[PDB]
Amino acid sequence: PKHEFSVDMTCGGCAEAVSRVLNKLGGVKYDIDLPNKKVCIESEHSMDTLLATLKKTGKTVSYLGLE
Amino acid sequence: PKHEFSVDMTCGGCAEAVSRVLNKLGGVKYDIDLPNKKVCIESEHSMDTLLATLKKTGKTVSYLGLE
Ligand SMILES: [Cu+2]
């Protein structure tokens, strides 16, 4: 499944921190779009696990949906 | 005790993120100096706990010692 999240990243540092928490979770393939404040994640991890992982950053996160 | 950490924050968004994770931990009095990449924390929480809480952000964190 391909999950789509809004994450309120406002600098390259914010983007890199997202990548680091996702790397720590593992079992993910992702792309981070800074100008559109979007993270897409291909994973077998649950929506809730991915959400909780992103929210660890301390950034505002919401779920946009799924393919 | 009064602990000091370096946290590699590059924008105000990064400072907010640090604020949010520390608020969620609770039992802390902190100040964040964004241009100097420094976070001072007065807490009864162990250094270990504060370090782990800061590293949750996915930002690079190091320990600048007791005041
Ligand atoms: Cu930032």
Domain limits, chain A: 1-67
Name the amino acid, one letter, at A55. Answer: K
Instruction: Identify whether the C-beta of residue B58 lies closer than 8 Å to the C-beta of residue A9.
Output: no
Asked if B52 and B22 touch (Cβ cutoff 8 Å), the reply is no
Interface of B with A in 25-54 (CB under 8 A): none
Name the residue with tokens 């680091």.
A20
Nearest to B22 by CA among B6, B38, B43, B8: B43
Q: Ligand 1 centroid to B4 CA: how many Å?
A: 20
- In single-letter form, the type of residue at position A66 comes to L
Measured in angstroms, the resolution is 2.1
Output the six-digit token pair for A44: 């077998």
Euclidean distance between CA atoms B45 and B1, whole angstroms: 9
Which residue's entry shows tokens 């301390």? A58
Q: B65 vs chain A: nearest CA distance in angstroms?
A: 24
User: Does domain A1-67 fall into CATH 3.40.50.150?
Assistant: no
> A10: which residues sit within 8 A by CB, 6+ positions away?
B11, B12, B13
CA gap B62, A66 in Å, rounded:
37
Q: Do B11 and A16 touch (CB under 8 A)?
A: no
Contacts of B9 in chain A (CB under 8 A): 13
**What phi, psi does B54 have (nearest 5°)?**
-65, -40
Task: Name the experiment that determined this structure.
Answer: X-ray
